[PDB]
Design a protein around this ligand. Structure first.
Ligand SMILES: C#CCN(Cc1ccc2[nH]c(N)nc(=O)c2c1)c1ccc(C(=O)N[C@@H](CCC(=O)O)C(=O)O)cc1
Ligand SMILES: C#CCN(Cc1ccc2[nH]c(N)nc(=O)c2c1)c1ccc(C(=O)N[C@@H](CCC(=O)O)C(=O)O)cc1
Ligand SMILES: *c1cc(=O)[nH]c(=O)n1[C@H]1C[C@H](O)[C@@H](COP(=O)(O)O)O1
Ligand SMILES: O=c1ccn([C@H]2C[C@H](O)[C@@H](COP(=O)(O)O)O2)c(=O)[nH]1
Lengths: 264, 264
């Protein structure tokens, strides 16, 4: 899409040559923001074919508060296998923090439940937030949260959301993170009887890995196409009752997929 | 400053009306990003005379890990009075989370010292973050954090910083926050022998209160003046050893001050 393709061009033109913890190298910029009016369509990239199957199961996985790769493997979703332990645990990552943030005194906070109730009962609140950046448990996580902080906002019966991504692999992860959250917004909006608003993406270290240069140049050649439309075919009793089948993307006519190496 | 004034104009041009828990009306937009090249000068508002004394003392107070206003009173800083209890306590706000975020294991994490060490030993890290948003202790705080989370970044021997402010009172609090963090960056930079880079400001619910409209337009009719210059007259042994006298602001010729009501 326009915004995404511009971010790619920006990294290429202004990026800085940094050496990352991988050793692979990187072109990087710091601080960037894009706005996606969800009224214009689901922000799923068209200049390259992306698969929602994994994006959806991961999100539903997150909402369960599950941090064991089990559910994902049972649905043929790899993504988190390269960081899971023997048993398939990743530590108190997204999900554990979303559904059971640990207080210093033993209790547990349910941020998703809180956010739902604030949306329904105090939509004007300026502190409707979900944070995965739990400092006290970062050392117990298989990896530090990339999409670490998000805030909801209601205005004219519309639900908007801003995500703060500390680290961003522009080529591989961004398309995935964007669709993931756009998805959540729709789910929340349906559960609270609100129209969808804007999805605002904000990133910290935004980069393109060196061995992605070819792919990026290839993708920048392709013309963006009309955005598809997300369809929710059922309104569950709660935001925790959604099932994979409930979603359907209509009108998605993307350019062919582009394979690329994942630096771990 | 150009960036600041354009923000105000944007809120006024694109903001929708909302009601906050203070019973006061507001004009707000959601999601915005601002950039300040610290090498251009110290980002202190000139279209309105600002008070540095308080800005500096609050910051030192934060770095000390202090959450009681006694210190602020000794130096005659009043900014926090309205929210302190009978004993001057504000609860586990900024200072406490920064210097001693409590984990569930009974440990405590000093995030400031941590980033300092990351800045010196692994400046390329994409996890140099300080968060005051402790879901577990929000209910003990006199006020939920406004400048909630910030990330550092190094490139070309320059230290940049990005702040995420969930809620922002454009006319009254923003000038304070900008200058506060710009100061933290200079200190962090001086301690790490780095040159200052950019201070990126990212806001969530950015608003102007209904009773600030006249002052806002008054200020908006003024022409920004050249940015002042910050001069540190000493290099302390640690980031925690700066005194008020170590700082000098030169070339500050602001327009007349503009008194305005604070929503509590
Ligand atoms: C962001 C995020 C979550 N994540 C996590 C995640 C973790 C480490 C990373 N490391 C690097 N170098 N780049 C990344 O974008 C990245 C993303 C993802 C995991 C795998 C794929 C991936 O390789 N894509 C495959 C599979 C897609 C699918 O199964 O649906 C592809 O062919 O597109 C994408 C996103
Ligand atoms: C940010 C922050 C810290 N804070 C804390 C803080 C806490 C709650 C808030 N609530 C609201 N409604 N607006 C705010 O900006 C705000 C700021 C401050 C508190 C007061 C002033 C203030 O009254 N402004 C006067 C100060 C005069 C003086 O120096 O004594 C001014 O005109 O500058 C500024 C900063
Ligand atoms: C909070 C503290 C700060 O440092 N700076 C700020 O601008 N503020 C503002 C935001 C808002 O006007 C009010 C907080 O209200 P709430 O927590 O959003 O409900 O103070
Ligand atoms: O949802 C995700 C997860 C990971 N990453 C990327 C960010 C970095 O490219 C790398 C993680 O590295 P560190 O930030 O921890 O160094 O994977 C994303 O872009 N999105």
């Amino acid at each position: 899409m326009k915004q995404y393709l511009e971010l790619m061009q920006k990294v290429l033109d202004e990026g800085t040559q940094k050496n990352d913890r991988t050793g692979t190298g990187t072109l990087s910029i710091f601080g960037h923001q894009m706005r996606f009016n969800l009224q214009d369509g689901f922000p799923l990239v068209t200049t390259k074919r992306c698969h929602l199957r994994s994006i959806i199961h991961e999100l539903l996985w997150f909402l369960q508060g599950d941090t064991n790769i089990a559910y994902l493997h049972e649905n043929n979703v790899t993504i988190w296998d390269e960081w899971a332990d023997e048993n398939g645990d990743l530590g108190p990552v997204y999900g554990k923090q979303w559904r059971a943030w640990p207080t210093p005194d033993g209790r547990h906070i349910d941020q998703i439940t809180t956010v739902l109730n604030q949306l329904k009962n105090d939509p004007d609140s300026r502190r409707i937030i979900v944070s995965a950046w739990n400092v006290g448990e970062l050392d117990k996580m298989a990896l530090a949260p990339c999409h670490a902080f998000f805030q909801f906002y209601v205005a004219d019966g519309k639900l908007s959301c801003q995500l703060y991504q500390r680290s961003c692999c522009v080529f591989l992860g961004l398309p995935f993170n964007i669709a993931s959250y756009a998805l959540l917004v729709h789910m929340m909006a349906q559960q609270c009887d609100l129209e969808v608003g804007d999805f605002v993406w904000t990133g910290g270290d935004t980069h393109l890995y060196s061995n992605h240069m070819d792919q990026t140049h290839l993708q920048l050649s392709r013309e963006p196409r009309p955005l598809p439309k997300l369809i929710i075919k059922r309104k569950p009793e709660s935001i925790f009752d959604y099932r994979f089948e409930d979603f359907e993307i209509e009108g998605y006519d993307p350019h062919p997929g582009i394979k690329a190496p994942v630096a771990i």
